[PDB]
Amino acid sequence: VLSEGEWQLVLHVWAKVEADVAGHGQDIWIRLFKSHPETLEKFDRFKHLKTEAEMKASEDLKKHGVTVLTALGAILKKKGHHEAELKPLAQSHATKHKIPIKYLEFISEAIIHVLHSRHPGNFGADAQGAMNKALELFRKDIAAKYKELGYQG
Ligand code: HEM
Ligand SMILES: OC[C@H]1O[C@H](O[C@H]2O[C@H](CO)[C@@H](O)[C@H](O)[C@H]2O)[C@H](O)[C@@H](O)[C@@H]1O
């Protein structure tokens, strides 16, 4: 359980992401696909992308980054009371996409890496710790739902 102070550190940096969610999403995808190439294989729609240049030039990938981060943002804004938001997300990711918790850890790492790079003014050690805590809560709750849905994760 995160404290209000921790949630505020999370929401304060997210406020910066929201200045340009599309751009932040592109950086996050590039970081993820480069650090853990196996994650790209889960996207039938994007697995053909061979380079960072192609990834950057993909309008659909850019659009999906907006979809992904907006969904994550809505979850963060609930400050732990995200039961309703996690239901559809866990169902599609467990049954259709088949995304292991390990891959959610990879994207969490990418998100943190990008915020650390772009936002040193709002992503110091305490802020990063709060974001990690928020993402761990997210993955913990997703894992619990995965279990209820029949997916090992
Ligand atoms: C911060 C964590 C994540 C969030 C909030 C998130 C969110 C979303 C949302 C909202 C959609 C569209 C609706 C749906 O199908 O549920 C989506 C689709 C998808 N996600 Fe996730 N996702 C996350 C992480 C991942 C990761 C790490 C992978 C893969 C390694 C992944 C793979 C997919 C795939 C394959 C789709 C379908 C893309 C398409 O339209 O072709 N997601 N995700
Ligand atoms: O912070 C680094 C550790 O990250 C992972 O573990 C956290 O998140 C898991 C959920 O994805 C939890 O099960 C675990 O309890 C958390 O500490 C990773 O699995 C660990 O190996 C890393 O040390």
Ligand 2 centroid from CA 148, angstroms: 20
135 within ligand 1 shell (Cβ under 6 A): no
Nearest partner of 28 among 81, 145, 106, judged by Cα: 106
Distance CA 150, CA 140 (A): 16
Which atom of ligand 1 lies closest to the CA of 111?
Answer: 1
Task: Output the six-digit token pair for 30.
Answer: 């590039």
Q: Is 1 helix (H, G, I), strand (E, B) or coil?
A: coil
CB-count exposure of residue 110 (10 Å: 0-12, 13-18, 19+) = buried
Distance CA 47, CA 37 (A): 10
Ligand 1 centroid from CA 43, angstroms: 9
Ligand 1 centroid from CA 105, angstroms: 13
136 within ligand 2 shell (Cβ under 6 A): yes
Distance CA 98, CA 76 (A): 23
- 42-54: string of b/e by CB count within 10 Å (b at 16+)? eeeebeebeeeee
Q: Cα 93 to the chain's mean position, in Å?
A: 13
Task: Output the six-digit token pair for 46.
Answer: 């994007």
Which atom of ligand 2 lies closest to the CA of 132?
Answer: 1
How far apart, in Å, do the first and last CA atoms of the chain sit? 22
92 within ligand 1 shell (Cβ under 6 A): yes
User: Closest-lying ligand to the alpha carbon of 39?
Assistant: 1
The verdict on whether residue 119 carries a ligand-binding annotation is no
Ligand 2 centroid from CA 80, angstroms: 18
The verdict on whether residue 116 carries a ligand-binding annotation is no
Domains in the chain, ordered, with CATH? Answer: 1-153 (1.10.490.10)
CB 48 within 8 A of CB 142: no
